[PDB]
Amino acid sequence: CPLMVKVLDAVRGSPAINVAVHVFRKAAADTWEPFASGKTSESGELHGLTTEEEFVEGIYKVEIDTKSYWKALGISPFHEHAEVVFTANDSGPRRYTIAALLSPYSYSTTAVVTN
Amino acid sequence: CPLMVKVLDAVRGSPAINVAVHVFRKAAADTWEPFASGKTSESGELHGLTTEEEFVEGIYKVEIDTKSYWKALGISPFHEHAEVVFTANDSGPRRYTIAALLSPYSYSTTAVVTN
Amino acid sequence: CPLMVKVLDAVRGSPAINVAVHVFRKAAADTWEPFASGKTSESGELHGLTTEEEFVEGIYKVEIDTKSYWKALGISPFHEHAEVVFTANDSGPRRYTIAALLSPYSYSTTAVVTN
Amino acid sequence: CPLMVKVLDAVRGSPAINVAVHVFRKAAADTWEPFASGKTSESGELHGLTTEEEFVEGIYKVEIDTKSYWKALGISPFHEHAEVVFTANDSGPRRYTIAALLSPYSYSTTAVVTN
Ligand SMILES: O=C(O)c1cc(-c2ccc(F)cc2F)ccc1O
Ligand SMILES: O=C(O)c1cc(-c2ccc(F)cc2F)ccc1O
Numbered sequence: 407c408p409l410m411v412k413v414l415d416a417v418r419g420s421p422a423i424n425v426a427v428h429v430f431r432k433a434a435a436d437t438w439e440p441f442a443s444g445k446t447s448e449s450g451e452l453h454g455l456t457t458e459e460e461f462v463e464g465i466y467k468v469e470i471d472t473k474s475y476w477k478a479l480g481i482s483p484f485h486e487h488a489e490v491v492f493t494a495n496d497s498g499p500r501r502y503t504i505a506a507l508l509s510p511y512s513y514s515t516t517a518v519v520t521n
Numbered sequence: 522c523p524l525m526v527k528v529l530d531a532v533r534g535s536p537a538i539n540v541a542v543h544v545f546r547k548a549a550a551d552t553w554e555p556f557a558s559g560k561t562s563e564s565g566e567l568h569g570l571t572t573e574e575e576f577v578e579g580i581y582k583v584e585i586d587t588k589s590y591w592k593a594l595g596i597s598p599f600h601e602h603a604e605v606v607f608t609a610n611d612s613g614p615r616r617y618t619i620a621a622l623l624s625p626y627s628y629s630t631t632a633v634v635t636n
Numbered sequence: 637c638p639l640m641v642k643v644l645d646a647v648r649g650s651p652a653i654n655v656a657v658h659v660f661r662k663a664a665a666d667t668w669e670p671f672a673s674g675k676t677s678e679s680g681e682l683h684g685l686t687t688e689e690e691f692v693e694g695i696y697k698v699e700i701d702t703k704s705y706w707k708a709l710g711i712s713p714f715h716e717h718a719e720v721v722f723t724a725n726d727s728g729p730r731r732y733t734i735a736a737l738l739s740p741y742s743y744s745t746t747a748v749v750t751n
Numbered sequence: 752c753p754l755m756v757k758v759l760d761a762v763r764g765s766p767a768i769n770v771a772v773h774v775f776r777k778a779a780a781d782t783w784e785p786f787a788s789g790k791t792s793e794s795g796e797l798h799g800l801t802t803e804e805e806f807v808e809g810i811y812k813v814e815i816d817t818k819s820y821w822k823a824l825g826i827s828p829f830h831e832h833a834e835v836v837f838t839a840n841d842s843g844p845r846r847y848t849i850a851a852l853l854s855p856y857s858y859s860t861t862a863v864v865t866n
Contacts, residue, residue, distance in 0.1 A: 417647060419714055419741030419864045437715055465601060484632040486580060489604040498633035507861055509739040511649030514851055514859060517599045520762045532762060534749045534829055534856030551695075599764055602728060620644075622746055624854040626764030631737055634649045673765040695831060714862045717811060719834040742857035 408461045409453040409494075409502050411468060417481075424478075425472075426471040429455060429514025438467060457459045463495040468504050476510055479502050483510040490515050523576045524557075526567040528585060530623045532596070536565025540590050542569075544570055549578035556581065559627050582606045585617050591625055599626040607632065638691045639672075639724075639732050641682040643700060646739045647711070651680025655705050659685055662695035671696065697721045698734050706740055714741040722747065753806045754787075754839075754847050756797040756813060761854045766795025769823075771816040776802060776809050777844055783812060801839075808840040812848050828855040835860050 409429070413422035425446040430438035442455040468490040476483035490504050503518040524544070528537035540561040540601050545553035557570040583605040591598035620634040639659070654693035655676040660668035672685040698720040722732050730743035733748040756757035758767035770791040775783035787800040812833070814834040835849050848863040 414861060414863060416739035416742035416861055419862045421863065426546035426776060437641075462530040484607050486608065489606060491601040491604060492599050494576070495599065507742060507859070509632070509646035509742070512629065512631035512646035512739070514627065514744070514748060514852070516759060516761055518762045518766065519599070519626070529746060529748060530747055531854035531857035534747045536748065536750070596762075622744070622856060622857060624761035624857070627761035627854070629737070629859070631644060631646055632649045633644060633651065635651070691805050714837050714864070716836040716838065719836060721831040721834060723831065740863035741864070742859065744857065746857035749829070749856070 407453050407455075407501070408458055408499065409455050409466075410428050410504070411455070411470070412448065412503060412505045413446050413452075413470060413509070414505070414507045415450075416507050416512075419479065420507055421448065422446060422475060422506075423448050425450075425475045427452050427453075427455075428469045428471070430467040433468070441466065458499060461499075463483060464493070466494050467491045467492065470505075470506050472508055472513065473507065479508050485513065488513050488515060490517075492517065522568055522570075522616065524570050524581075525619070526561070526570070526583060526585070527618060527620045528561050528565045528567075529620070529622045530565075530590075531622050531627075536563065536623075537561060537590060537623055538563055538565060539621070540565075540595075541586035542567050542570075543584045545582040545584070547582070553582055560561050567613065574630065576609065577607075578609055578610050578611050580606065585621055585623075587623055595623050600628065603630065605629045605630050605632075637683055637685075637731065638688050639696075640731060640734070641676070641685070641700070642735045643680045643682075643703075644735070644737045646679075646742075647709075647736050650737055651678065652676060652705060652736075653678055653680060654708075655680075655686075656701035657682050657700070658699045660697040662697070662721050663747050666696055666735070691724065693724055693726050695721065695723050700736055700738075702738055702743065706736065711740050715743065717742045718726060718745065720745050720747075752800075752846070753803055753844065754800050754811075755849070756791065756800070756816060757850045758791050758795050758797075759850070759852045761797075761852050761857075761862060766793065767791060767820060767851075767853055768793050768795060770795075770797075770820045772800075772812045775812040775814070777811070778823070786811065791851050802810050802846060806840065806844075809838070810836065811839050812836045815851050817851075817853055817858065822851065822860050826855050830858065833860060835862075837862065861863070 431441040470488040585603040700718040776786040815833040
């Protein structure tokens, strides 16, 4: 699993469950093409987005649908979504964990990249 | 000044100086139109992006050019840039400060909205 | 003002107002002696804690009374307080800003050190 | 495993390996008694600190030795350590993950609490 997304809720101290995630890959025409999508599990994790074969070098955008998450909890948050844009696999295949920690008016994102 | 941007460097414990910032407004055609831009000052702040008259309700994107910042310091970063996407709402007089704290493999962003 | 404290609220997107802050200096007997204290202002800032003459090199602890802050808002928090422990060094003229961003189950702290 | 500690490095985008962690529990005499200690693994995680039987209700302090970690990497960081102080098990037994994300002049900590 070369690309995993993990989302946590800083208000409740819990995984952020059922968060929609959309991944895009930049195409030669300077356009974002849909690449993979899913929702976080009860553990706040989203596995199985892609395979080593399909996850080639490129610029990828991970959009985490934070506004939909907060609204379902009755909170009107500031951001529309969190976007994580990065070059992947430019030095060869790597495994990427994109983690996000969410509050209504703030979020943090970190990448853990392993060989 | 209804919209200000402040950027900090978590590696050096300093304002992030000379960081390029581009602001876009979402247009009816589902496209990002350039709205304002600048570079952060010696205090890490970018003032004067817009006016009360021009900063109407809508969806805005603030792109912070973090990759160039780390490259100028000789540090290998993860993200292409940091993107902050939000709706501006007329809920009474408001000032929006978009703050970002930068590390090579992580960033956090918060909105401070005051009257 | 060589030492300033700034506190933000990541749930409301606002300065954290009326937060008690206590500063201690490490004494030779491996004990924390009270040094300065106050409450954050309407801007979330606490100025005037010390002077250049009194703020000598040493180990300092800044305790931010986060639990009382969340309790006043009716939100159940995790931490008893946030603690920031650091050495102050005479590396030339310096001003220290200790910033903290608060959520019920998470906080971040950064030092901005400027000349 | 009712108490686990996870540490990440925001400069390298990696687990923070070999980070020393000391846990203390507040005793009736208003004193911190040593409770457990260990070092993070190659995955940045520290398991096996305590048992359900020994991890009773109380106020606990988790000290993460961040300064020693950064110095071994040739970085002089701002903080002496990160301290996480919290009441545990006051509503019955819970499982606690204390996560910390480290940069030289900044850190963030979050708790994930599950039943
Ligand atoms: O940038 C973030 O999203 C972030 C993430 C963590 C964190 C990382 C990994 C993990 F397993 C748990 C966490 F809380 C802790 C703090 C933080 O700011
Ligand atoms: O999410 C962020 O960008 C963030 C910002 C701050 C911060 C905000 C405002 C300020 F004047 C100083 C700061 F360190 C402190 C911590 C933090 O995580």
